[PDB]
Ligand binder design. Structure first.
Ligand SMILES: CC(C)(c1cc(Br)c(O)c(Br)c1)c1cc(Br)c(O)c(Br)c1
Ligand SMILES: CC(C)(c1cc(Br)c(O)c(Br)c1)c1cc(Br)c(O)c(Br)c1
Lengths: 114, 114, 114, 114
């Protein structure tokens, strides 16, 4: 699997479970095609999000529903959504882990690229 | 001005100058209307980016072109853009500062709301 | 003033007011001399924390009492303090801004150096 | 093992290998006893840093030699050292992972607490 996520809650110091997300691929004319959805498990991860066959080079977007996560935690959030938009270069079995650190008014998006 | 940005370069320890961005307002059918653009000055800011009248309550997207910033610095970045999406409640001259901390494979988006 | 701080609360989206800190200068035998203290104002800052004359070249530690800040907010933090340790080169009126972003289980320490 | 680390390089998007660190425990009179050293492997981790027997409750400090890491990467760093100072509450087999995101002029210290 070429695309994984790891989400941590910076208020509690635990993985962020039950965070919903959507994965989209940019079209040539600049639009977006949704290709996958998922929800983090209690470890802040999702397994088998997409396959290598679904992951050519190009621009991708992962939308994390952080506003719902914070509302359910009981904290008013700033962001309406957490969008991570990146260029993928899969040639060579390069894998990507999108790491995300969440606070109600702040998040950090990092990548670990194999 | 109710919407400010402050961008920092975490590699150099300086404000991120000459970063292009665009501000868009969400439409009823889920689209986006571009309402302002600019390029940060040497302090990582854009003075007077939008007016009170241009900033009614609603969802906004500020798209920062971080890729070109890094290319110009000589690095190969992960993200295509930095996205900050939020619901604005400008009543009472409430003000929004979008702080952004940039590294080639990571950024942090923080909000300072009056 | 050559040494400034700017502290933000990532839970609330506001500057972190009423954070105690201490500034220490490293000694030859590896010890630490306290040279200044203060408490941030409502903008997350301490105006005029030290003078030019108090800030010769050398290694400094700024210790922020983030634990008590969080206890007072009602959260149970991870860190005992936030530590920022750096070698200062104040020649030419070079200025240092210590930016600090706080959550109960995470902080980011960034430097803006002129 | 009750204390682990995970270090990422935010410039390259890879784990930070070969980062040296020292672990110390605070004494009653406010001093420090070094109890362990280590160096991250190519995954940014260290295994078997300390034992549970070595890890009573108390104040601990992990000093990461990030200045040497950045010098060897070829980038001038801001911080002289990255110090993570925390209260440990091991009762119940609670484990701690110190996560660290490194840029030359910025780092983020987070904890994952089981
Ligand atoms: C404290 C705050 C929000 C900040 C707000 C304003 Br306005 C400033 O001018 C500066 Br200087 C700092 C900040 C921003 C970023 Br970006 C950081 O990486 C970290 Br750490 C802290
Ligand atoms: C989610 C978390 C805590 C993480 C924990 C483990 Br354990 C991992 O192996 C990986 Br990868 C990520 C993390 C860490 C850093 Br350093 C970050 O900059 C961000 Br954003 C998130």
């Amino acid at each position: 699997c070429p695309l994984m996520v790891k989400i941590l809650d910076a208020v509690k110091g635990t993985p962020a479970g039950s965070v919903a997300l959507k994965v989209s691929q940019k079209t040539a004319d600049g639009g977006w095609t949704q290709i996958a959805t998922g929800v983090t498990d209690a470890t802040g991860e999702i397994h088998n999000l997409i396959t290598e066959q679904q992951f050519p080079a190009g621009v991708y977007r992962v939308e994390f529903d952080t506003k719902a996560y914070w509302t359910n935690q009981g904290s008013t959030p700033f962001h309406e959504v957490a969008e991570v938009v990146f260029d993928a270069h899969p040639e060579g079995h390069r894998h990507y882990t999108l790491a995300l650190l969440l606070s109600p008014f702040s998040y950090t998006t990092t990548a670990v690229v194999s």
